[PDB]
Amino acid sequence: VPQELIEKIKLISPGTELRKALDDIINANFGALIFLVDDPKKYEDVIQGGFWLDTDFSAEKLYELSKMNGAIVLSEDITKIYYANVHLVPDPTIPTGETGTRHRTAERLAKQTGKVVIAVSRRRNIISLYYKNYKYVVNQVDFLISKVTQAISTLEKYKDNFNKLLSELEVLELENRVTLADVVRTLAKGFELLRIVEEIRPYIVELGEEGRLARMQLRELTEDVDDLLVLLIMDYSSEEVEEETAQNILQDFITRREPSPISISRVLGYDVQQAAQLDDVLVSARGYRLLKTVARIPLSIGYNVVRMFKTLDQISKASVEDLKKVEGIGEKRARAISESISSLKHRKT
C-alpha cells in the first residue's frame, strides 16, 4: 500500500472535518462525488456547469452542497470549496471496472488527472477513494472497531500463551536443560503474535483519531516482545549473531517467511528436517537475554561478557572478581550480573 495513497487516506480519516462531513452525508443517504484539485482553471475541461463558489471549506457547507445533484470540487488541502453541482466529464474511453455512473466517473477522472476523487453512493455506507490507478474503500468506524477489538482479543490469547512458554523456557534456561524444541516453540508463538499486529495495522490506520485506544492496547500487549525475540535469537542461534542480524531474522519471520518449527530452527542454523528432531537437540543460552534484561548490561558490553564466558551457565558460575576482568564490568556491573542471576536461580529453580 503506497505511501502516496496513505497520505490521501489521511484526508478522510476519523478526526478530519472532511470525514465528519462525509459521515453526515452517509448518515443522510445523500450521495457524494468530490474532486480534489489545486488549480481549478487547469481542469476546467473536465468541469462543466454548476456554481462557482470559491469559499472557505467547512463540514456544514459540504453537507449542504451535497444535497444538490452532481459533483463538488475542493482544493487538495481541503481548505476551499471551488465548485458545487458540477458535471464531471472524464474521457469515456478510460478503462474502469466500477459500476454505476458515479463510481465509473470517479475512477476515470482520477486516472485521467492524477487527482483524488471521492464517491459515496446513496444506499451504501462506504467511502470510495480514487487517486491515480488506486482505489481504496474506507470503512465506517463501527466496522473497524469490531475487527480491531477482535484482533486485540486474539492478541491477548497469543500473548498469554507466549508468557507461559517463556516462563517455562526461563526455568529450563536457568537449569541449563533447554532443547531446540523449547526455543523454536517460543519463537514461533512470538513471531505469530507480531504477525497479527502487522496484519491489523491497516485497520488501525483507517481508524484515525478513533484508533487511539486501540494503539495503546497494542503497545501494552507487545511492548518488549520484539527485543525479547531478538535476544532469544542471539542466545540460541547455532553460531554467534550480531544484534542487527537477529533483528532481520525477526523481520523475515514477521513478514516474508512462515514461522514453521523446521523453518525457524533451520534459519537459526540447525540442520534438522523433521519436527521430532528438535526434542533431541540440546542448546545453551549465550546469556544476552539475561544480561540486557535483568542485569541491565548494555548489549555492546554484553558482547565482551559472552566473548569471555560463552554461555549463561558459565556466567552463572563466575564470581564477582571473575566477571570484573571483562572490558566494561566494574564492581557495579559485576554484582549486578552475579546477584541477579543467583536471585533468579533461587526464586525460579
Ligand X SMILES: Nc1ncnc2c1ncn2[C@@H]1O[C@@H]2COP(=O)(O)O[C@H]3[C@@H](O)[C@H](n4cnc5c(N)ncnc54)O[C@@H]3COP(=O)(O)O[C@H]2[C@H]1O
C-alpha cell at 320: 564477582
- The answer to whether residue 29 forms part of the interface with ligand X (CB under 6 A) is no
* 70 assigned to a ligand binding site: yes
Least Cβ distance, residue 193 to ligand X (angstroms): 45
- The answer to whether residue 87 forms part of the interface with a copy of itself (CB under 8 A) is yes
Instruction: For CA atoms 111, 129, 126, 106, give the dihedral sign.
Output: negative
- The answer to whether residue 123 forms part of the interface with a copy of itself (CB under 8 A) is no
* 222 assigned to a ligand binding site: no
The helix (run of H) or strand (run of E) holding residue 279 is none
Least Cβ distance, residue 103 to ligand X (angstroms): 8
CA atoms within 13 A on the CB side of 55: 12
* 101 assigned to a ligand binding site: yes
The residues, any chain, with a CB within 8 Å of residue 237's CB and separated by 6 or more, are 246, 268, 269
Residue (49 or 298) nearer to a copy of itself, CB:
49
Residue (97 or 114) nearer to a copy of itself, CB:
97
- The answer to whether residue 70 forms part of the interface with a copy of itself (CB under 8 A) is yes
- The answer to whether residue 101 forms part of the interface with ligand X (CB under 6 A) is yes
User: What are residue 123's phi and psi, to 5 degrees?
Assistant: -100, -20
Q: Return d(Cα 7, Cα 92) in angstroms, integer.
A: 28
- The answer to whether residue 205 forms part of the interface with a copy of itself (CB under 8 A) is no
Q: Which does 49 bind (CB under 5 to 8 A by kind): ligand X, a copy of itself, none?
A: a copy of itself
C-alpha distances out from residue 110 to 35, 44, 135, 157, 343, Å:
8, 15, 9, 43, 65
**Residue count at the site for a copy of itself (CB under 8 A)?**
13
- The answer to whether residue 29 forms part of the interface with a copy of itself (CB under 8 A) is no
HEC per residue, 58-75: CHHHHHHHCCCCCEEEEE
C-alpha distances out from residue 289 to 114, 116, 119, 169, 229, Å:
51, 49, 52, 12, 9
Task: Tell me which of 3, 56, 79, 92 binds a copy of itself, using CB under 8 A.
Answer: 92
- The answer to whether residue 330 forms part of the interface with ligand X (CB under 6 A) is no
Residue (91 or 331) nearer to a copy of itself, CB:
91
- The answer to whether residue 69 forms part of the interface with ligand X (CB under 6 A) is yes
**Three-state SS for 179?**
strand
- The answer to whether residue 88 forms part of the interface with ligand X (CB under 6 A) is yes
- The answer to whether residue 71 forms part of the interface with ligand X (CB under 6 A) is yes
Selection from 70, 67, 6 nearest residue 34 by Cα: 70
Q: Which residues are annotated as a binding site for 3',3'-c-di-AMP?
A: 70, 88, 101, 105, 122
Q: Which residues lie near ligand X (CB under 6 A)? A: 31, 33, 69-71, 87-88, 100-102, 105
Q: Which residues lie near a copy of itself (CB under 8 A)? A: 48-49, 69-70, 87, 89-92, 99-101, 104
